[PDB]
Ligand binder design. Structure first.
Ligand SMILES: Oc1cccc2ccccc12
Ligand SMILES: Oc1cccc2ccccc12
Ligand SMILES: Oc1cccc2ccccc12
Ligand SMILES: Oc1cccc2ccccc12
Ligand SMILES: Oc1cccc2ccccc12
Ligand SMILES: Oc1cccc2ccccc12
Lengths: 297, 308, 307
């Protein structure tokens, strides 16, 4: 009966809509929801540090009335001195949710199968579903309804943002295109899962090496750091590519950006950019996710 | 008032320990009902060697008392190196309402407590682990009722911090404590003598034996712990062969009273000092025991702050 | 207009007086001001860790109702995987103020020029203005009115405390003397800025190698460690030049009979200051360390209200 969020498709289309509505409500009234008043605890655990992820979760948990107990790298990695299952059993006595940044999906699934509190994938090798919640919140702010929009992601199509934009995007009814060079394409099982979910929402999945075609008529253009660099240079999100999009298109980028590589100063700082609101919305979207999971768990 | 500290289990009298354990039960029921640190007031939580489990328990506990834990971990300069211990104690006493400290030798705790003008708590040290034993006693009371006259046997390294604190804290509660350990691994004589003296006041007793089977027979509570701390991994000894007869396994548990429970300061090394079958069976109380660090430490802080 | 506090003279004499008054009020009533109720966040960022700085800000922010998000030097250094300007713009969405311990003053300037929330220098290579606020709070507690007092600093005359005592001291109307060996004198730009500020307040600036003359008649004697961690490999003998400038009992006896002694902790007993001075009745170092809490909270309250 305990709900987890390890990958974007763990929410149904209707559930994702609820979380995104909650994110908009919490952005307007950031201390109106206090499910963790007490304070109650939430564990925020990093096998590898991610300062931006820790910052967003730590403040968000505090604004829900709770106390984040943060476990950094440098500390004993989880599972090193104790079985994962033993640690999960005790954690479930101390905190009301477990937020975890680890690498393989195997470890996340193992924790979710045993823990009796919700487990959230803060960021992993395969998915980055909290950032895509924030992306979807950002798109809804700038454009309104998500269903039927065209979103193109450019660059490394095998990384966690590509996978999550596929799954999270089609869950929202967005037609998702991944524009990537050969050998950096989506994981085939992720692509299949997105194609299947798209059948329910009227969305679609496209994977192409043609950056021009992916930009043409796009409503949302996304990229992410590339880490040779040489296969990705034709996919740089520059002014020439942006000029092909639909009017009022917006540009997203999980920060940090490497200006001059995957994205140019002119695109980052121009009027289509929504990267600053997008970064802020990690706070609101993650708070919404926690509120929603806690209420069901 | 005199400033009260908690550096070893017998720093509380039997009556005082009963007061803390009663408060721990009350706080488990109503975890935000005591707010002596509302403000927030600060509490320093200092680690000469990091302990994530100890940190979770104190950080959350202090917050649930209304306070803010300021954590200093081993990445900072170790206390006493860039600044004298006495200088640090003086300034800490201006910033925080209590000092929680995980360190090594007991003389450091003593030095801090002699000069600090706020309560000092031993979070975990080489010689004692008195906060875990408060949680242990809370767990035993939950599972079995009155502590006085129970029989508790600890198995393994009889000179580690858990053996010492189970001796002192157990006999303070009126529990007859047995330590089952191989030769060369017996409790420190000064601790053993202190436990024997305290046991006279409570009607308890202290027993030290190498006969694991005899220690298990008739026991109400069986306890073990890892055989080797991190600081002993390079001590030169074979720290497996001596301890194998003291493993807390199903055969040993079956010698005890039919209603006996099992305790273990986590983490456990399954297959060494304890088996899966015992950890995961119905006698195991190790999960509640770990949770109860939260409640017992909150009770200790509330009690020390009120008396100081 | 967003106000920053990157160096001591970012506050006018009148503004400094307002902050120090607020520090005294907060010391009396430490949880009466809640501008960060929510909690709202405050970023506390360390390019090089300082446990005492982090300890005092983290608790102070909590007592203002906020939540300090501490970024240690274990994170990628600010400006390396992202431009400083980009990080500033996102931080302004997350927190109501940015407290930063960094190295060169140009980095602080760069952050303040683009951030839309107040930026505070927690401690830097050139200045330590938050500690000097705590010092002025401490002097006021022990001595009363600050105007006209005579303060002498001894030791490395070009470190952050020397610079901030010059700027913060003359802002308060204090006659500041820096006693230091040749080669270790205040930055010329800082000395000139202090000299100009002193003309507004009736204060004065003196730099001398004559430690005995600097101590004579002084109301406050200050010293600091002779070497920061970053100077340990600079090639200099950083002991022998400073020995004549040791704050010892002989030097203290030259000052006014009611003089007090300050030292940013930690101190190295036996080097820049002696046990007899640290532990005697003139020492104010313990109150001084505590007042980091109150003075920093006051600065935050004041900057948040004005910005
Ligand atoms: O990563 C860890 C190592 C050891 C103990 C832990 C307890 C809770 C959460 C994380 C832990
Ligand atoms: O074993 C553990 C795992 C995670 C958290 C803990 C807290 C206290 C005591 C033990 C713990
Ligand atoms: O261990 C330490 C090193 C440096 C500063 C400290 C301040 C408080 C408590 C502990 C400290
Ligand atoms: O010296 C110290 C020891 C412990 C805590 C401190 C906090 C602020 C300033 C100095 C401190
Ligand atoms: O230093 C940093 C590295 C990466 C991310 C950061 C976010 C906020 C403040 C500082 C940061
Ligand atoms: O890029 C950043 C700089 C500072 C803070 C951040 C927090 C969340 C996401 C991104 C951030």
């Amino acid at each position: 009966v305990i709900r987890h969020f390890l990958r974007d498709d763990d929410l149904s289309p209707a559930e994702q809509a609820e979380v995104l509505e909650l994110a908009a409500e919490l952005k307007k009234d950031p201390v109106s929801r206090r499910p963790l008043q007490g304070p109650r605890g939430v564990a925020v655990i990093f096998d590898k540090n991610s300062t931006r992820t820790r910052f967003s979760f730590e403040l968000g948990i505090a604004q829900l009335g709770g106390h984040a107990v943060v476990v950094d790298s440098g500390s004993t990695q989880l599972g090193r001195d104790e079985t994962l299952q033993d640690t999960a059993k005790v954690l479930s006595r101390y905190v009301d949710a477990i937020v975890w940044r680890t690498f393989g999906q195997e470890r996340l699934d193992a924790m979710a199968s045993v823990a009796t509190v919700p487990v959230i994938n803060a960021l992993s090798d395969e998915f980055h579903p909290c950032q895509v919640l924030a992306d979807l919140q950002t798109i809804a702010e700038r454009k309104g309804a998500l269903r039927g929009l065209r979103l193109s992601y450019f660059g490394d199509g095998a990384n966690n943002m590509a996978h999550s934009l596929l799954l999270g995007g089609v869950t929202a009814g967005i037609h998702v295109t991944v524009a990537a060079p050969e050998g950096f394409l989506p994981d085939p099982s992720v692509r299949a899962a997105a194609e299947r979910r798209a059948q329910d929402t009227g969305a679609s999945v496209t994977v192409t090496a043609d950056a021009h075609a992916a930009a043409a008529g796009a409503d949302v253009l996304v990229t992410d750091t590339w880490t040779r660099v040489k296969p990705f240079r034709p996919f740089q999100l520059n002014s020439r590519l942006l000029a092909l999009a639909d009017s009022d298109a917006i540009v997203l980028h999980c920060l940090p950006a490497h200006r001059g590589d995957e994205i140019t100063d002119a695109v980052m700082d121009g009027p289509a950019s929504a990267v600053w609101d997008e970064a802020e919305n990690r706070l609101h979207a993650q708070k919404a996710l926690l509120v929603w999971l806690l209420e069901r768990s």
